[PDB]
Structure 1
Amino acid sequence: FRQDSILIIYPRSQTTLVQFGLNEETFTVPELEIPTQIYRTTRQDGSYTYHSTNKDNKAELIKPIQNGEIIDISAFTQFLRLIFVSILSDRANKNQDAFEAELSNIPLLLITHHSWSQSDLEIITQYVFESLEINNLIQLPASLAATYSISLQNCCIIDVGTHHTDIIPIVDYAQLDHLVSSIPGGQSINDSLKKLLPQWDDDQIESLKKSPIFEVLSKNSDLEFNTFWDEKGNEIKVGKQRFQGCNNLIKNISNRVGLTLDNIDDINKAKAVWENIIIVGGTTSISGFKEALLGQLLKDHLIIEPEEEKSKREEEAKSFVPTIEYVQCPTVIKLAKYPDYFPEWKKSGYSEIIFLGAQIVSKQIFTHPKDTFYITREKYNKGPAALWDVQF
């Protein structure tokens, strides 16, 4: 397929990143960022006409996705219509031959979430091939589109949007459905920010959440108070709470990642996922949230000869330090690496790197003949039962 024909869509808990037309040398930041939202005019006959704008205030702003989950599947397929049709019309205005070049056959690469149901993705394929009439479709998961950003085989995907946190173990490029645990999102970061900065509002604490002076401790730190600027350009100073706020969610994710990855009967894949902890989402432009999340993981779930007993047998050694040999799995806890060879993504950050691995997957599979990973039109001639035939 053509990378100018490639459409990549990531609806997240607030915003939907859309890119049509890859940058094709290094992949770009997803240029379009809609909110994850579509107005629906309930036409009085019960039919629904779907708009991007509040059409005569009979339209209701239906977010198709918050907390990652599809929360209106028909409005999500019509938000796929709203985005897709917009790509078609905008390339019918800007390019106008793209209906033979970019819109002649759009390999629609849609980023899915763990909380999207089976009937959700089947109705997605139905509306995509019958009502969107899209002959070629990947439903790429957000965890795999995170893990292919450096084709990581075993990792932990922590989708911290502003609203929700997924903890998703990936083993052999595949998600454990029984171990995915979604605990709440930068609103839990905002929540302990409000616990620690009571005098502020949601705009001040959210601008702190998108401030450069936002860290977690586990120089901004040597300063007691630091000054960032509000959305209206007002200088706001903050004490040690700019080293805090994320720490409550850090402990919540940390205990949830421990209870996720220590319950595995396979003692070895636990450590390989334990050393590739990935934390993604529009919140995760916060500095130090991933760092103190790792530090709290090492605080809660790192198996070692503990400092009482390792100090005791440091003293037994000074009588070369041996370690009391434990049997448990989480003995090494580490994070994973981000591809620095994308200057568009080096510049525009890796907080939404799910789109980056989606771009890499799109240049892989679509520019390949491999329809083992996308449904063809003839493959629809098993339908969304061929959606079950085109998974990775």
Structure 2
Amino acid sequence: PFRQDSILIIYPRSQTTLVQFGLNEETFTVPELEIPTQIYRTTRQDGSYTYHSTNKDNKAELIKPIQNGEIIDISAFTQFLRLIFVSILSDRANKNQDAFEAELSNIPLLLITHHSWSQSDLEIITQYVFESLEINNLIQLPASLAATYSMISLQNCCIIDVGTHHTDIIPIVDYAQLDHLVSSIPMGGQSINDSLKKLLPQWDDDQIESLKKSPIFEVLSKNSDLEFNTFWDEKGNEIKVGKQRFQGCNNLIKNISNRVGLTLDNIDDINKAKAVWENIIIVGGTTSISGFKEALLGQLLKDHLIIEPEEEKSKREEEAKSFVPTIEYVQCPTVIKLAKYPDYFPEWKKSGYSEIIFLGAQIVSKQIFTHPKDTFYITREKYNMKGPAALWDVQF
């Protein structure tokens, strides 16, 4: 144990699910498999359910198991995992045919979880992985920790994970996710869309979405020099736009910031707190919008930095006209910083770090699965003894 060919990482999210089977060994590659997170559920007279990849003869209903990051249908969710897992087996079993003795003989699974999943959901998933998929080794890695492990392993930090309809805020102290501080706001990328609809009434949804995803949309805090600029439709249609391309991100940025502030203010050990504020981690699709992260930082500074009020400072400098020492405050944060990205994953640098949580998982899985110690995953041994409850003896 274990073959690197064999490591399987799954990262399921509301819209899609990133998947990878086998680690490259030279450098880590950005996940190439992206499967929409949904399954079809046919209902068979007599009550029971059947699950397919396609609307079978238009008889099945379309189930979207994960919504706003939460599992809303645990059965369709497990069926969706099986569907992924089986597909991978078939694919490899064709290509190579000796696969069941090699690449498919011992498949350890790392499943990236979301803060919102029940213990009940996590146990059921564990049961499913050991009983239905007949897999033997499982790590359930929280998304937040994947984040901090990718980010050159930070003991103290805050994860701001911007989704489409919600943003999660998750403080990590001493490599532990602080559950009672964790929260999400019902606000994300779509907010930008919505802000823009108000600013550009005569546009439609696809036009607005296209602007957001275009080279000329940025958050300010040379394109910025031009009054108007140009970009092209999804359907090739050229669209011109004024100052609106520097708008629409503000309401979201303010909401996130207000939340970050209330959160970090409830970290009880001020020495931990100082560290967290100095390692803000921002992740998610939205964050690839040029200027966004820096704009968000800018706002956290504007709202939360402990520093002398400018008027007060200006008086003191007039007074000294007749050198001014720095006023020291008892509060934190006096320093706010974004955590430093690792620049030595070439493939990741190339594609941006909106999905860096996955790199977290590539690193953890290699660590854990290419070393003897079985301290951080459930094994068959353990499953046989405690069952799904085995899960809680290997939490991080």
TM-score by shorter chain over 0.5: yes
Taking the aligned partners of 1:47 and 1:90, their CA distance within structure 2 comes to: 29
Q: CA RMSD in A?
A: 1.5
Higher-Rg structure is: 2
TM-score under structure 2 length normalisation = 0.95
* More displaced 10-residue stretch of structure 1: 96-105 or 179-188: 96-105
Question: What secondary structure sits across from 1:116 in the alignment?
Answer: coil
Q: 1:12·1:161 contact (CA, 8 Å) conserved in 2?
A: no
* More displaced 10-residue stretch of structure 1: 118-127 or 227-236: 227-236
CA offset digits 1:178-201 (Å, max 9, x no partner): 111201321122222223333322
Taking the aligned partners of 1:60 and 1:142, their CA distance within structure 2 comes to: 30
Q: 1:148·1:357 contact (CA, 8 Å) conserved in 2?
A: yes
CA offset digits 1:312-370 (Å, max 9, x no partner): 22333444332222221222111112222111111122111111111111111111123
CA 1:54/1:329 → structure 2, altered by over 3 Å: closer, same or farther? same
Taking the aligned partners of 1:103 and 1:308, their CA distance within structure 2 comes to: 68
CA offset digits 1:66-106 (Å, max 9, x no partner): 22211211111111111111111111122333322222121
CA 1:36/1:316 → structure 2, altered by over 3 Å: closer, same or farther? farther
Question: What secondary structure sits across from 2:141 in the alignment?
Answer: strand
Percent of aligned pairs with the same residue? 100
1:173 CA displacement: 1.4
1:127 CA displacement: 0.7
CA 1:124/1:333 → structure 2, altered by over 3 Å: closer, same or farther? same
Taking the aligned partners of 1:367 and 1:274, their CA distance within structure 2 comes to: 34
1:122 CA displacement: 0.4
- Greater share of helix: 2
Structure 2 partner of 1:279: 282
Q: 1:106·1:134 contact (CA, 8 Å) conserved in 2?
A: yes
Q: 1:215·1:243 contact (CA, 8 Å) conserved in 2?
A: yes
1:205 CA displacement: 2.1
1:16 CA displacement: 0.8
Number of equivalenced pairs: 392
Taking the aligned partners of 1:198 and 1:100, their CA distance within structure 2 comes to: 61
TM-score under structure 1 length normalisation = 0.96
* More displaced 10-residue stretch of structure 1: 361-370 or 90-99: 90-99
* More displaced 10-residue stretch of structure 1: 115-124 or 99-108: 99-108
1:27 CA displacement: 0.7
1:164 CA displacement: 1.7
Question: What secondary structure sits across from 2:165 in the alignment?
Answer: coil
| Among 369, 391, 395, the residue aligned to 1:391 | 395
CA 1:103/1:207 → structure 2, altered by over 3 Å: closer, same or farther? farther
Taking the aligned partners of 1:182 and 1:389, their CA distance within structure 2 comes to: 27
CA 1:154/1:197 → structure 2, altered by over 3 Å: closer, same or farther? farther
CA 1:327/1:55 → structure 2, altered by over 3 Å: closer, same or farther? same
CA 1:87/1:253 → structure 2, altered by over 3 Å: closer, same or farther? same
1:166 CA displacement: 0.2
1:136 CA displacement: 0.6
Taking the aligned partners of 1:319 and 1:85, their CA distance within structure 2 comes to: 81
Structure 2 partner of 1:183: 185
Question: What secondary structure sits across from 1:284 in the alignment?
Answer: helix
Question: What secondary structure sits across from 1:30 in the alignment?
Answer: coil
Taking the aligned partners of 1:236 and 1:369, their CA distance within structure 2 comes to: 58
Structure 2 partner of 1:123: 124
* More displaced 10-residue stretch of structure 1: 40-49 or 127-136: 40-49
CA offset digits 1:236-278 (Å, max 9, x no partner): 2222222221221100101110111112221122221111111
